[PDB]
Amino acid sequence: SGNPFQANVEMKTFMERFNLTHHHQSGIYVDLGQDKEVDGTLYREPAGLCPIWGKHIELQQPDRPPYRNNFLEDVPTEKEYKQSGNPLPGGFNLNFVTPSGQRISPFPMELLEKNSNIKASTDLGRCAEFAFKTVAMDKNNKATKYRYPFVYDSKKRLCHILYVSMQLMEGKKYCSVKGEPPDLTWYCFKPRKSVTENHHLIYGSAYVGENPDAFISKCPNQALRGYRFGVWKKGRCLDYTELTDTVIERVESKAQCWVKTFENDGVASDQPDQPHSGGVGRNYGFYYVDTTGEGKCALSDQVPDCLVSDSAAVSYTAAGSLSEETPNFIIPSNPPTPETALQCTADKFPDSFGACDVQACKRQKTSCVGGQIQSTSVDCTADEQNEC
Amino acid sequence: DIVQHMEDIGGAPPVSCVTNEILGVTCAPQAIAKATX
Numbered sequence: 090s091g092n093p094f095q096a097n098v099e100m101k102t103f104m105e106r107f108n109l110t111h112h113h114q115s116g117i118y119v120d121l122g123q124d125k126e127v128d129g130t131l132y133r134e135p136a137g138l139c140p141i142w143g144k145h146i147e148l149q150q151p152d153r154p155p156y157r158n159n160f161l162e163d164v165p166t167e168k169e170y171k172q173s174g175n176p177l178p179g180g181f182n183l184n185f186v187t188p189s190g191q192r193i194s195p196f197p198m199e200l201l202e203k204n205s206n207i208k209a210s211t212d213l214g215r216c217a218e219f220a221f222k223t224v225a226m227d228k229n230n231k232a233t234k235y236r237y238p239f240v241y242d243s244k245k246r247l248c249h250i251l252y253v254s255m256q257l258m259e260g261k262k263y264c265s266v267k268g269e270p271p272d273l274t275w276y277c278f279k280p281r282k283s284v285t286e287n288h289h290l291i292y293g294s295a296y297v298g299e300n301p302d303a304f305i306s307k308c309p310n311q312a313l314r315g316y317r318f319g320v321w322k323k324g325r326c327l328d329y330t331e332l333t334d335t336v337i338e339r340v341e342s343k344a345q346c347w348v349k350t351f352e353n354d355g356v357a358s359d360q361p362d363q364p365h366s367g368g369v370g371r372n373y374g375f376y377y378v379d380t381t382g383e384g385k386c387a388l389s390d391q392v393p394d395c396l397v398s399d400s401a402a403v404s405y406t407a408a409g410s411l412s413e414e415t416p417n418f419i420i421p422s423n424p425p426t427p428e429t430a431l432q433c434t435a436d437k438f439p440d441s442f443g444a445c446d447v448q449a450c451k452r453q454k455t456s457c458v459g460g461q462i463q464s465t466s467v468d469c470t471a472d473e474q475n476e477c
Numbered sequence: 478d479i480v481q482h483m484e485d486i487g488g489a490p491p492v493s494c495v496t497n498e499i500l501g502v503t504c505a506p507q508a509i510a511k512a513t514x
């Protein structure tokens with residue numbers, strides 16, 4: 090102990106943004122964390138408090154008109170499905186309108202930023218709040234407490250509400266892949282993140298809008314450059330590569346690692362039986378270059394409580410973006426960066442060394458380099474090595 | 478059965494209208510495909 094990353098309120102608050110069981114509190118790959126009654130039937134509801142950057146639902150419709158394979162297309166009308174045949178055409182987007190024909194979805198950010206009811210301080214927050222402020226009506230035309238999930242398109246600046254809260258459909262008894270088998274009503278679909286595509290899409294439960302500025306300080310929105318996540322054990326920060334249950338793979342790029350923190354088979358997921366992960370899962374990882382120059386990806390389910398300095402590493406989570414820098418649409422109109430939380434000055438922040446961990450024969454070294462806290466494990470002293 | 482299976486994977490209520498605090502009540506202008514709900 091004497092974990093520098095737990096040493097004071099501000100550091101603790103900083104490191105807490107990485108704990109997806111603390112604030113997000115639901116599934117990531119599939120989020121169905123809540124149950125809501127509509128008209129006497131209980132339904133599963135996306136519930137997570139953090140936006141999932143880059144998450145989209147990839148569809149398996151036939152590759153031909155009228156099918157667009159794009160979840161952001163309107164849900165299909167009965168007449169459209171009659172014309173297409175199987176499977177269902179269209180996408181997940183809510184197509185409802187007011188009596189004058191104004192669409193609820195997609196809804197332009199340009200209207201949300203000048204509306205007195207919308208209190209959020211960022212564009213993402215305003216989309217999330219719009220989603221929170223939308224509820225299903227039941228068969229008596231009464232408001233319920235059931236809320237559809239949203240996708241923010243930060244490229245087009247459009248807020249989408251999804252009528253389809255399903256995120257994963259599979260099994261050849263239920264859905265077809267590219268129209269095969271042709272008798273099936275549903276096409277298959279699954280959540281994806283991609284090394285190149287749809288980074289500008291952000292998927293979330295409507296509950297991201299419940300306290301719509303909260304995600305800015307409580308969610309790991311951006312990748313963290315320059316550090317590997319680790320856990321504090323035997324007096325020093327062990328990065329995931331030192332942990333037994335860690336999954337380590339060679340990767341050709343950092344982006345592939347970011348995609349693996351979301352797609353790997355242990356990511357927090359609520360998909361069947363109705364599991365509630367509570368955000369527990371293998372959601373954390375980092376790209377690093379190992380000592381022989383190979384690019385690797387380490388994935389773990391251990392929530393990080395310290396960091397190991399490594400200027401060529403980048404730490405990702407299942408929830409966050411590939412981007413390492415705060416984008417403009419989450420900066421308040423009016424929360425410290427990693428650079429700020431991790432800042433030090435050389436003459437105020439002396440080197441410290443912890444006790445030798447005689448099992449590994451290594452000790453913690455914490456120092457200030459380049460105005461930023463460094464945290465590594467170094468060789469023990471000669472005498473200490475006697476004890477190893 | 479098929480209803481329990483769909484519910485377990487997030488199949489949503491058969492809803493024709495939503496209320497939004499900015500727009501008020503908003504409804505499908507044509508019947509939505511039944512299977513969607």
Ligand SMILES: *[C@@H]1O[C@H](CO)[C@@H](O)[C@H](O)[C@H]1NC(C)=O
Nearest residue numbers: 105108110111112392393394
């Ligand atoms: C993550 O949050 C959960 C629940 O809030 C908590 O029990 C756990 O201690 C946290 N883990 C940390 C800070 O490493």
